[PDB]
Design a protein around this nucleic acid. Structure first.
Lengths: 116, 130, 92, 98, 103, 149, 180, 99, 176, 54, 321
RNA sequence: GUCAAUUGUUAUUAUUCAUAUUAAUUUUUUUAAAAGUUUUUUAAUUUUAUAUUAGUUUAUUUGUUUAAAAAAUUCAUUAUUUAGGAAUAGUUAAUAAUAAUUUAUAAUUCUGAUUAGAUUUGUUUGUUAAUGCUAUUAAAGGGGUGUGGAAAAAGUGUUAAAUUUUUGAUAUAUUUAAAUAAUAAAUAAAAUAUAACUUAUUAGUCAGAAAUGGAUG
């Protein structure tokens, strides 16, 4: 048995109007337009083990002015259904990847490419 | 049943012989009369009107009960003086009579019958309302 | 009907006695007046706890001293401002 | 275990009406009570002996004489509504249903 | 704080906070050339799990079949970060996470 | 008990004794020096019923809420339906609610002073409404054990 | 609405209707039987109280003996007691505020307690329904009708707002010379 | 449940319902009598339904009176403590600043 | 063999307890006497709930709909006051629209004392009413005919109100 | 305790709780509130009775 | 289980029924109920109050791992925390964020929070039967009318006993074809009448208030009458275990159906003559009441009466002790 | 702040694992059950909307008046099985009421996807001293004149339900479905209304309660 553990990072920093209302995570994907893929942590607590592990997932969020560069810390919130999979909007960006803007200012991709 | 012989009520023989004589001749009328007028004994009876026997407890046709007993329907004396089927007409002939005589029926006759007077109304001390 | 039922009501002395089941409603809000033996924060039955323990809402401070730069002598004396035949043993 | 009781007649005198002129018989009154074919009231008329016979028949007594449930329903208030002020005035609906 | 508690219960002769960051010293105390601390065990065999103790979960321990029994000593780290033995922990009726046991 | 008192636990009990004062000697050796609070007095004297009945009158309670009748509801239907109020079986009615009905607050749930007294009405078979006396009310709560050892 | 009508459960006025106080039996023998009174919407779904708004109380159909009374023989009003518990709080709400329906099945019981008058299906067969005519009721309405002014104080108090601030009370909530 | 008496207005058409729901001009009058007995007995409801609705409202206004009154005791206490915690806190940020 | 006390003291957050916490013998003798001591509603703690940014307004409108809609025909004049309470009971702090909506609806219904009750509630809630709201309560005070009320409310809230002098600028721009 | 071949536990209880053998080994011993469970298997075991005793 | 009033306070009073009114609701997976103890809420409660937040390894760790707070696997601060981070250490957070809410002032200045309405002005001005307001509004006149049964109940109680005293005065006499007077019948009723006054389970105390005004002066000494009864029952004619002749009727208990010698499978026992033992049982039965005469709190008088002393002395002389 | 408590006769030892109890299939007459829904003036028209199928694990989500009765939506987060494991495909996103051949190269996937196999997605069980192991729903099968407020619309019944009070003196109905019957299983009788099967019985006898003879070899 693996039961959802609400007490976590996003719960402790932000008062969530309902379950999972707001979330926080790193901007993994900005390939799609007006849609910054984010990886955030939703906790699962094992009563058997009595230890809780983190299962990280992928959420989409809508950034209007294309403000989210790869490697940023965003504080997203839930909202009305924008598409089949977007229901989040980037409420605020905490940590901007300075390099990501500058490494784009040089003319490159905001992150070196993966290896495999 | 709970108050086996605690009621000081007197028997039917001494009190109401006409009911005692109205009883169906159960051959034990010397015994049936000895019971109280209030008793819950489901005695048989004779149709005063319909020439048949009918089963109505002593107090029902009597209409009398002990203080502490839950009072009966206050108009039972007539309901059980008459054998039940043959009884219906009696209490309906009276009210239908005074019904057509004015074309009016209101069951509220009890209230005006309950009304002894505005003097009797003041037997209630009403409360100092806020 | 209404008057002649209220009128006969105006005669009987058994009336004019406030019947609780008619006069009012005991409690209107869905949450009870006080905590009544329900499972506590730690999951134990109310038999194993006493209401008003440490989980009780904080009673709150008494005074009000906003700053660290709270500098006033003749203060700090305004917090405390403390016949009869008592039995000797008990007063001991 | 002494427990007295106000007998069911003493709370309310249960007196049964005599037949009105419209259904003055034991049989014709039961003929009035076949609202739907599932209650064959008419072929069960003979089961009761007279007017005053039908009226006092109880849940145990009606049942023991073989009266099926739908009849155990329909025959009842034909008496009761009659006691209350509604004699069994109901146009049979078999043909329209059928 | 734990050694401070065990000391006041006497399972150890006496601790000392040398204020060294790494390690401090505690003097064991023997009786009948047998160590006073028969069975001492850390509550959470793993750091990932941190079991917390209701003021009743401790109170059930003090009663071994109807006799108020303060033999075993459990240490609790209160929410206020006061290292407290289970005995005092039920006294002022406050819970905390469970560090270890000793008896 | 299996408590392990410290080696110096009664020190405050000592400097009390080692510094006690007594005006007359009998005070020093009085037989009821042990008795400090009422919780002590109730037990020490709980043996001799004699003083126990005469010192504690409140233990043998004699004051209960008098069985009080409640007025009915004047029904506009007239006497045509007023037969229903009278019946065979005296109906017992008790109040249930998210507020009231719980065991722990029983001593408050039936307090004669608490404005929120749980409501218990018995419709007597005649039709009158009376308050249920304390015996029936408690029967709506669960049972309890009690006996003089 | 459905080409196949839900035959064994036909209900009026579409769905999903307002609350109705109902009597749900827990299907066991009559000895073990004990019904419920509960505020549920009109239609019943097969998920068995999926749609229960609020649970009022419990009724026992079997006449129980002395409910552990002191076995008082002297009252003589110690008939077989019929226990019944009812949530007056919620009922005062749903009946009054949300205007739920009221089914006769339970209603007869509530009438016993003092909340409500006898139900309709309760028919005093000895006392039939009376006859009515406007004329003889006019003279009564002509004879004894309450004054308009007094009645306006009655219904207003009886229906709108019982709590009316008396001058004495009004004399208290009047402020004082510090800030008056 | 609409009832279809026998002397009710009949229709001699076999295409549909045979009996019609069109009363006899006496069944109108018995109705206005039997319908009245309801109105005679029913007008008690809208009297009660206003009464019970009145109490429950006044109930909510006197019960929640004590509640808001008591809840205010808690929040005023809980908050005065929170501004006091940041006070008991800020001195630590000071002393740790000294360290 | 592992200690039995451990086998209990280990699984304190056992999913059995989790149900009794709601995360996903029985007489009156056992329950403590200290139960009957808690005063009315003391058992409840403070509650600081954050609601959705939109639902902050929708919920206000429904409250704004009842108060200014209570005095239609059926709902009692008092009802306007009962909706102000149900909001406050559930921690929605009552905004100035819900205050004016009460005093207006209450005055229209001839209820003057109750119209002051709404004013004391906002005196209890320690909500400082703006000038628009201050004049509102004074309006019922006119129907109330009490100088003792207006004088009281005068000192407390509208003391520093000063006429716009010729030299002062104009209605201040939004600064918050 | 792990006497070689078994892991035996002794714990308090309201009364004597054990199998038919261990019942007497505590009762014929003299204990009253004892409670014992012999590893529920006595891990290092052939089927031998002395391991229940030692 | 958790109660249901938890649902309302978090979401809204009576928010339940509005949600129930959904057309497509509960089929097949309902929206379950949010019943979570108020101190265990995900959002509102801080770390110092919610125990679950005090978890470290996957809880507070990530926070200090994000905030930059020097954090260890165990330390002096709340959760795996050693010292403040550079930000907390340098910036003043007293008045940053939401302004200090005005309702705080309510605490130090508490006169504002006051119950506008009298809790008794709810409709319960007379729910307290013993209050001063109750007797005032009811007046002295209707005051007794509220409790005519409490007087009638108590008074009818005695008139059961005063009647029983006379009927079963002398137990030797017979009241049936096999029915006899006996001392137990008055006692077990009286005990039951003393049961109502005194018991904890069958608990009725109001009756004693009415004793002063519902007492029969014929029974001011309830217990002398009790002792005057055994002196009658001491006669050697009828069985002391049976109240029937020990010769006429062979086996006792047939004649009074309530006799406990008959059980689900209770057989019979022979009769007995009046012997020393059945002199002694009377003695202890005579004794037990004597001490009770003064020790009985509800009925027994304060001290013995001249009617009592001669009454017991009668039983002694008769029982030949 | 009142209830956690473990019972196999083993067979060198290691290894949860044959013969035990609990709960189940075995296991048996005491709860079902058949058709004809019903209105209406118009050959018509009002009112009569989710058990039983077939194969689904990133899955199933919702009402303008219909009723009630006098500006609330089509979206979502989560959790998803196979022992030995590699690709998927009317694509994704942005335009827009475009896009049968627009614009990007996109989208899923080893954090185990798609196809295939089994399973109807679980406040329901059982076991237990207990984290656990171990069950459960009678329940939505595409679109093709589009009705209706909502497709839930040629099986699949049973609820006191269907626009006059049909009827509650009823709970009883006999063939196909769950639903634990050896109900004081053996001595004194049933405050009965007398109807139910009818006889209603088996196992053991080396080890461990208990055997000799007779065969056998």
């Amino acid at each position: 048995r693996r039961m959802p553990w609400p007490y976590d990072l996003t719960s402790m920093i932000f008062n969530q109007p309902r379950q999972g209302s707001d979330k926080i995570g790193y901007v993994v994907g900005t390939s799609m337009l007006k849609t910054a893929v984010v990886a955030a942590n939703h906790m699962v607590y094992y009563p058997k083990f009595n230890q809780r592990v983190s299962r990280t997932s992928r959420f989409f969020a809508h950034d209007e002015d294309l403000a989210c560069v790869e490697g940023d810390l965003v504080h997203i919130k839930q909202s009305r259904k924008i598409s089949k999979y977007k229901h989040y909007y980037v409420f605020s960006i905490l940590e901007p990847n300075i390099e990501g803007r500058e490494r784009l200012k040089l003319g490159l991709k905001a992150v070196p490419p993966p290896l495999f | 049943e709970v108050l086996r012989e605690q009621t000081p009520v007197v028997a039917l023989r001494e009190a109401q012989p006409e009911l005692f004589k109205g009883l169906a001749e159960n051959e034990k009328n010397d015994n049936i009369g000895s019971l109280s007028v209030t008793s819950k004994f489901r005695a048989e009876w004779k149709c005063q009107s319909c020439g048949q026997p009918y089963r109505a407890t002593i107090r029902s046709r009597t209409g009398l009960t002990e203080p502490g007993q839950a009072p009966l329907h206050p108009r039972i004396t007539e309901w059980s003086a008459h054998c039940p089927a043959c009884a219906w007409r009696t209490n309906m002939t009276a009210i239908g009579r005074k019904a057509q005589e004015e074309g009016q029926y209101l069951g509220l006759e009890t209230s005006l019958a309950e009304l002894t007077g505005a003097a009797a109304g003041k037997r209630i001390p009403r409360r100092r309302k806020l | 009907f209404r008057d002649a039922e209220e009128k006969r009501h105006a005669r009987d002395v058994v009336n004019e006695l406030p019947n609780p089941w008619i006069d009012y409603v005991t409690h209107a809000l869905p949450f009870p007046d006080r905590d009544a033996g329900y499972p506590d924060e730690y999951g134990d039955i109310g038999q194993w706890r006493a209401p008003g323990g440490p989980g009780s809402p904080v009673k709150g401070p008494g005074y009000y001293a906003p700053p660290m730069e709270g500098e006033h002598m003749r203060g700090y004396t305004a917090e405390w401002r403390d016949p009869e035949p008592w039995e000797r043993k008990y007063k001991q | 275990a002494p427990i007295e009781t106000s007998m069911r007649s003493e709370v309310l005198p249960v007196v049964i009406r005599p037949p009105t002129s419209y259904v003055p018989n034991h049989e014709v009154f039961l003929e009035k009570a076949d609202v739907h074919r599932l209650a064959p009231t008419s072929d069960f008329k003979a089961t009761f002996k007279d007017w005053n016979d039908l009226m006092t028949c109880s849940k145990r007594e009606l049942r023991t004489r073989g009266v099926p449930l739908l009849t155990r329903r329909a025959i009842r208030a034909a008496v009761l509504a009659f006691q209350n002020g509604n004699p069994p005035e109901r146009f049979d609906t078999k043909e329209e249903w059928l | 704080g734990c050694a401070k508690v065990l000391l006041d219960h006497g399972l150890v002769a006496g601790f000392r906070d040398f204020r060294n960051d790494r390690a401090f010293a505690v003097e064991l105390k023997y009786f009948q050339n047998e160590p006073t601390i028969n069975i001492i065990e850390p509550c959470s065999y793993d750091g990932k799990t941190e079991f917390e103790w209701s003021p009743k979960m401790m109170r059930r321990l003090m009663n071994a079949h109807g006799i108020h029994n303060r033999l075993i000593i459990y240490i609790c780290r209160t929410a206020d970060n006061r290292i407290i033995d289970h005995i005092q922990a039920v006294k002022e009726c406050i819970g905390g996470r469970g560090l270890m046991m000793a008896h | 008990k299996i408590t392990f008192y410290s080696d110096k636990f009664l020190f405050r009990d000592l400097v009390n004794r080692r510094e006690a004062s007594y005006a007359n000697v009998w005070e020093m050796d009085d037989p009821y020096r042990f008795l400090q609070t009422e919780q002590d007095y109730e037990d020490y004297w709980g043996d001799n019923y004699d003083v126990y009945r005469r010192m504690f009158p409140e233990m043998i309670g004699k004051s209960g809420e008098p069985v009080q009748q409640y007025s009915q509801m004047p029904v506009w239907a007239g006497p045509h339906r007023d037969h229903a109020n009278k019946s065979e079986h005296n109906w017992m009615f008790a109040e249930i609610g998210v507020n009231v009905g719980h065991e722990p607050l029983k001593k408050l749930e039936l307090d004669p002073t608490n404005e929120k007294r749980r409501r218990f009405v018995i419709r007597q078979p005649d039709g009158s409404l009376r308050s249920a006396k304390m015996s029936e009310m408690r029967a709506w709560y669960w049972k309890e054990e009690w006996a003089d050892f | 609405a459905r080409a196949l009508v839900d035959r064994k459960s036909p209900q009026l006025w579409g769905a999903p209707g307002a609350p109705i106080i109902r009597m749900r039996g827990h299907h066991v023998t009559w000895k073990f039987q004990s019904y419920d009174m509960f505020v549920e919407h009109t239609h019943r779904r097969r998920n068995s109280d999926i749609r229960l708004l609020h649970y009022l109380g419990k009724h026992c159909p079997h006449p129980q003996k002395s409910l552990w009374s002191p076995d008082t023989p002297v009252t003589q009003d110690r008939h077989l007691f019929m226990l019944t518990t009812i949530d007056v709080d919620a009922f005062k709400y749903w009946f009054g505020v949300k205007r739920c329906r009221l089914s006769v099945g339970p209603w007869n019981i509530l009438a016993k307690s003092g909340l409500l008058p006898p139900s309709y299906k309760q028919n005093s067969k000895i006392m039939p329904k009376p006859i009515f005519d406007k004329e003889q009721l006019m003279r009564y309405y002509l004879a004894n009708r309450k004054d308009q002014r007094q009645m306006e104080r009655e219904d207003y108090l009886n229906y709108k707002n019982s709590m009316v601030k008396s001058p004495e009370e009004r004399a208290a909530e009047r402020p004082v010379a510090p800030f008056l | 449940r609409q009832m279809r008496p026998y002397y009710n207005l009949p229709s001699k058409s076999e295409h549909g319902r045979r009996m019609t729901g069109f009363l006899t001009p006496y069944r109108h009058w018995m109705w206005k009598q039997n319908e009245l007995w309801r109105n005679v007995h029913e007008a008690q409801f809208e009297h009660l339904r206003k009464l019970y609705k009145r109490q429950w409202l006044e109930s909510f206004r006197v019960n929640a009176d004590e509640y808001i009154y008591k809840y205010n005791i808690t929040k005023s206490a809980q908050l005065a403590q929170w501004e006091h915690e940041m006070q008991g806190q800020e001195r630590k940020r000071r002393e740790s600043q000294q360290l | 063999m592992r200690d039995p006390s451990l086998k209990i003291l280990r699984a304190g957050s056992g999913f059995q307890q989790l149900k009794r916490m709601g995360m996903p013998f029985r007489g009156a003798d056992t329950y403590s006497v200290k139960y009957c001591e808690q005063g009315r509603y003391e058992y409840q703690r403070y509650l600081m709930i954050n609601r959705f940014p939109s639902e902050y307004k929708r919920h206000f409108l429904r409250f704004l709909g009842n108060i200014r809609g209570s005095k239609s025909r059926d709902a009692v004049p008092q009802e306007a006051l009962h909706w102000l309470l149900r909001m406050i009971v559930d921690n929605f702090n009552p905004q100035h629209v819900h205050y004016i909506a009460a005093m207006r609806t209450l005055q229209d219904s001839g209820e003057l004392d109750m119209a002051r009750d709404v004013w004391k509630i906002m005196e209890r809630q320690q909500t400082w009413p703006d000038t628009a709201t201050i004049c509102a309560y004074l309006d019922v005070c006119v129907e109330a005919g009490e100088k003792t009320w207006a004088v009281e409310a005068w000192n407390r809230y509208c003391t520093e109100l000063r006429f716009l002098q010729a030299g002062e600028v104009d209605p201040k721009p939004i600064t918050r | 305790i792990n006497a070689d071949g078994a892991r035996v536990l002794l714990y308090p209880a309201r009364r004597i709780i054990a199998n038919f053998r261990v019942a007497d080994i505590l009762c014929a011993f003299g204990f009253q509130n004892a409670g014992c469970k012999i590893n529920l298997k006595a891990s290092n075991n052939p089927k031998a009775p002395t391991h229940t005793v030692e | 289980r958790q109660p249901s009033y938890i649902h309302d306070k978090r979401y809204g009073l009576f928010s339940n029924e509005h949600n129930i009114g959904k057309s497509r609701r509960g089929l097949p997976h309902i929206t379950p109920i949010y019943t979570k103890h108020m101190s265990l809420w995900e959002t509102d409660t801080d770390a110092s109050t919610n125990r679950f937040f005090r978890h470290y390894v996957f809880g507070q760790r990530e926070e200090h791992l994000l905030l930059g707070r020097p954090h260890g696997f165990e330390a002096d601060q709340a959760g795996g925390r050693q010292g403040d981070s550079a930000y907390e250490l340098n910036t003043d957070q007293r008045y940053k964020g939401v302004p200090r809410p005005a309702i705080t002032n309510l605490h130090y200045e508490p006169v504002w929070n006051q119950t506008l309405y009298r809790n008794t002005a709810h409709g319960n001005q007379l729910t307290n039967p013993s209050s001063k307001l109750t007797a005032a509004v009811l007046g002295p006149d209707l005051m007794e009318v509220r409790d005519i049964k409490s007087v009638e109940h108590c008074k009818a109680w005695f008139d059961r006993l005063s009647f029983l005293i006379q009927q079963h005065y002398d137990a030797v006499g017979d009241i049936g074809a096999f029915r006899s007077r006996h001392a137990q019948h008055v006692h077990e009723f009286f005990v039951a009448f003393h049961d109502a006054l005194s018991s904890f389970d069958f608990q009725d105390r109001y009756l004693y208030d009415q004793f002063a005004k519902a007492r029969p002066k014929h029974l001011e000494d309830l217990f002398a009458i009790f002792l005057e009864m055994e002196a009658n029952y001491v006669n050697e004619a009828y069985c002391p275990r049976c109240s029937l002749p020990y010769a006429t009727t062979r086996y006792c208990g047939e004649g009074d159906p309530n006799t406990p010698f008959r059980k689900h499978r209770g057989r019979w026992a022979p009769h007995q003559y009046w012997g020393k033992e059945w002199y002694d049982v009377v003695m202890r039965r005579a004794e037990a009441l004597w001490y009770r005469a003064t020790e009985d709190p509800f009925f027994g008088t304060t001290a013995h009466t001249q009617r009592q002393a001669e009454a017991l002395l009668s039983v002694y002389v008769k029982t030949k002790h």
